[PDB]
Amino acid sequence: DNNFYSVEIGDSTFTVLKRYQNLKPIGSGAQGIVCAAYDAILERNVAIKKLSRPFQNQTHAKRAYRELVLMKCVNHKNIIGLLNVFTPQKSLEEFQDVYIVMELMDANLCQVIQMELDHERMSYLLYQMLCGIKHLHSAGIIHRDLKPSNIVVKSDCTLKILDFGLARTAGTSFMMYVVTRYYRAPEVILGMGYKENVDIWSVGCIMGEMIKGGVLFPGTDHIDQWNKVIEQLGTPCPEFMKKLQPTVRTYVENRPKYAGYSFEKLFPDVLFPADSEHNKLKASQARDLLSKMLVIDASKRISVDEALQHPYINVWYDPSEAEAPPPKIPQLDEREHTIEEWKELIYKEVMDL
Numbered sequence: 001d002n003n004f005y006s007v008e009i010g011d012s013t014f015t016v017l018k019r020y021q022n023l024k025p026i027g028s029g030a031q032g033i034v035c036a037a038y039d040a041i042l043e044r045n046v047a048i049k050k051l052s053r054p055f056q057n058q059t060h061a062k063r064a065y066r067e068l069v070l071m072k073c074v075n076h077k078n079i080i081g082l083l084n085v086f087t088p089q090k091s092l093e094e095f096q097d098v099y100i101v102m103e104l105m106d107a108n109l110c111q112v113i114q115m116e117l118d119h120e121r122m123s124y125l126l127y128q129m130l131c132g133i134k135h136l137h138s139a140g141i142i143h144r145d146l147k148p149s150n151i152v153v154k155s156d157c158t159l160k161i162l163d164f165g166l167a168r169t170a171g172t173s174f175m176m177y178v179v180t181r182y183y184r185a186p187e188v189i190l191g192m193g194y195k196e197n198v199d200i201w202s203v204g205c206i207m208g209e210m211i212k213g214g215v216l217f218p219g220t221d222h223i224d225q226w227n228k229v230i231e232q233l234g235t236p237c238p239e240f241m242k243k244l245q246p247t248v249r250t251y252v253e254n255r256p257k258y259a260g261y262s263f264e265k266l267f268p269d270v271l272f273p274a275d276s277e278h279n280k281l282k283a284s285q286a287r288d289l290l291s292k293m294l295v296i297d298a299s300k301r302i303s304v305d306e307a308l309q310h311p312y313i314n315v316w317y318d319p320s321e322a323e324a325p326p327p328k329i330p331q332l333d334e335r336e337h338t339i340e341e342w343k344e345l346i347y348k349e350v351m352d353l
């Protein structure tokens with residue numbers, strides 16, 4: 001008879017399979033309704049995220065279709081994986097909602113930054129992130145939306161990536177979505193274009209956040225962000241200014257020039273674990289890697305491959321999380337389609353279950 005069951009949670013009607021019970025929602029209150037439940041069949045706890053109405057507009061279905069198809073066919077330690085997908089409606093007529101279950105994680109990367117950590121833990125967390133993005137870049141996907149709230153870790157400091165970002169499609173910084181400007185690159189904020197090193201900037205800001213305990217570049221508005229970057233890092237050299245668009249090229253030069261601060265005073269030894277030569281040398285190496293990754297000019301930005309071979313990170317090097325086989329997604333398309341086609345397109349995968 002019935003294979004789905006109902007409960008009204010978080011001001012919303014939630015209906016999924018009976019295998020999961022004792023629904024407990026996330027208290028974060030963030031967009032995307034997800035609750036924690038326990039799956040009886042395989043004896044593991046699960047996180048379940050509901051699509052409210054995937055087809056409210058063209059922006060929704062495009063991102064919803066993207067994340068389902070690619071999460072189904074990439075399989076990596078540092079990227080979150082998909083276990084089951086289903087929707088209660090059995091025909092497309094009233095098919096209107098979709099649910100996604102996946103492996104549960106203990107916490108966000110945000111809260112992990114609050115608790116003091118050590119170099120062994122910090123680096124392994126970054127190592128995982130770089131091979132998470134390196135596995136994505138090899139597939140041809142630029143995240144550009146990396147932030148602590150899109151990153152989850154477990155009790156063993158195993159890190160997994162929650163989001164697939166925009167997959168290198170949209171280049172706008174403020175869309176109809178992300179509540180964070182802080183971790184975004186200088187090129188994206190200036191609309192100068194992006195390459196594969198854009199994401200290196202955001203892992204640099206996240207890494208710097210662990211050391212200090214606060215957001216590295218806190219910007220109240222779109223343009224405060226740029227001011228905060230150059231208040232601490234210094235004004236860029238003229239060669240960087242040439243490629244900028246003239247309308248806002250003018251503005252950067254007319255904006256005041258700041259010499260900037262060096263990473264030793266940006267990241268002092270007090271915030272690091274210290275008093276040891278191992279600690280002092282690990283404090284050096286951490287700051288040195290921050291310098292290579294927190295570069296305004298994209299051309300001197302350290303690559304993810306070189307970042308993995310940095311002494312601070314290479315201690316965890318083993319090819320199977322890093323040098324994985326590239327995931328292949330041949331249904332692939334660069335095009336946008338009808339709203340009715342969108343439901344029919346996603347209906348195929350959820351009903352070919």
Ligand SMILES: *[C@@H]1[C@@H](C(=O)NCc2cccc(C(=O)Nc3ccc(Nc4nccc(-c5cccnc5)n4)c(C)c3)c2)C(=O)CC[C@@]1(C)C(=O)OC
Pocket residue numbers: 026027028032034047049103104105106107108110111113114148152162213214215
């Ligand atoms: C950090 C940031 C922050 O999150 N800080 C503390 C905090 C406050 C309130 C709630 C939470 C919270 O709910 N955390 C949390 C709870 C459960 C889970 N479980 C979970 N597991 C697997 C998968 C998912 C998931 C996956 C996909 C979509 N949705 C959920 N969920 C998780 C991961 C997290 C935490 C802030 O809120 C602001 C302040 C910040 C920036 C800060 O102070 O950093 C220094």
